[PDB]
PDB file of N, CA and C in Angstrom:
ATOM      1  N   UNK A   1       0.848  -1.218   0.000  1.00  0.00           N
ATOM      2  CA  UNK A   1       0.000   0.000   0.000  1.00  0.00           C
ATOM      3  C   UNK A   1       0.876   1.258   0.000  1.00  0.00           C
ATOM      4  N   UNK A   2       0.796   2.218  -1.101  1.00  0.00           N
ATOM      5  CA  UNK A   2       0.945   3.696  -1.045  1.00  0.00           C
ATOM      6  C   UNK A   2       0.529   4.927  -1.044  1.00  0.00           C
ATOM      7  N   UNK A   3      -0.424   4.999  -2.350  1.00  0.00           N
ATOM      8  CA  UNK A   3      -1.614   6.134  -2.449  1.00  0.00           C
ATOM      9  C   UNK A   3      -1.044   7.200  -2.414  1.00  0.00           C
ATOM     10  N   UNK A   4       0.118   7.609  -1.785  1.00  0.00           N
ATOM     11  CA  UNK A   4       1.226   8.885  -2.071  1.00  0.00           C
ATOM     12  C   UNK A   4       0.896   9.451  -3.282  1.00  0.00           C
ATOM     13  N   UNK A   5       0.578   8.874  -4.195  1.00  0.00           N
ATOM     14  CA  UNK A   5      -0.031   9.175  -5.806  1.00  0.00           C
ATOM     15  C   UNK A   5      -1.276   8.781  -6.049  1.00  0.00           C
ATOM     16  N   UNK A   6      -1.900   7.829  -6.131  1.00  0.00           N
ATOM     17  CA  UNK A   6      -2.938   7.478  -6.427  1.00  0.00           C
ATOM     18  C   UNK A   6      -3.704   5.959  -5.571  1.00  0.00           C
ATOM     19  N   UNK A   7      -3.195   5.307  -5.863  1.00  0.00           N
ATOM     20  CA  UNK A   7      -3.300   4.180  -5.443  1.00  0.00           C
ATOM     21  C   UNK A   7      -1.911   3.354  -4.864  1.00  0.00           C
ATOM     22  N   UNK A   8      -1.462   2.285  -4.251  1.00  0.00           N
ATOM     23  CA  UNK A   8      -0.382   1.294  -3.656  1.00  0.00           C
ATOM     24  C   UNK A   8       0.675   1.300  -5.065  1.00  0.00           C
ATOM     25  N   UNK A   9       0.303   1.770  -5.672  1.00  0.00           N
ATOM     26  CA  UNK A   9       0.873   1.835  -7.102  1.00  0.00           C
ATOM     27  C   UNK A   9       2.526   2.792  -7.155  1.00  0.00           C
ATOM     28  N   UNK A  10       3.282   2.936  -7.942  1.00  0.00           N
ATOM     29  CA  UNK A  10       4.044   4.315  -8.283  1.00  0.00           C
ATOM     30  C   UNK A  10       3.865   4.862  -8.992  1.00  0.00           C
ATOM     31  N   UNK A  11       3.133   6.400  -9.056  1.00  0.00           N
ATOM     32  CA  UNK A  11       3.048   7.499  -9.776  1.00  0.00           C
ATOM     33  C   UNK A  11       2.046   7.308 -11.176  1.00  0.00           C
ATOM     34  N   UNK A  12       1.280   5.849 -10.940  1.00  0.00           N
ATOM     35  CA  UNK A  12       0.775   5.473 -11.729  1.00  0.00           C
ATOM     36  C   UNK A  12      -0.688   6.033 -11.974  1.00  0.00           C
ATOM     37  N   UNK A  13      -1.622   6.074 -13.506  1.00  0.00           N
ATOM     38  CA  UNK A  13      -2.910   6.410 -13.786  1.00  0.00           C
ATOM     39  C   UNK A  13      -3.882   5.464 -13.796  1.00  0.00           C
TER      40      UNK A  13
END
């Protein structure tokens, strides 16, 4: 889990 951006993802759409 991340969401820092969007979702647990990196910097991803």
């Amino acid at each position: 889990e991340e969401s820092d951006d969007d979702m647990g993802f990196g910097l991803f759409d």
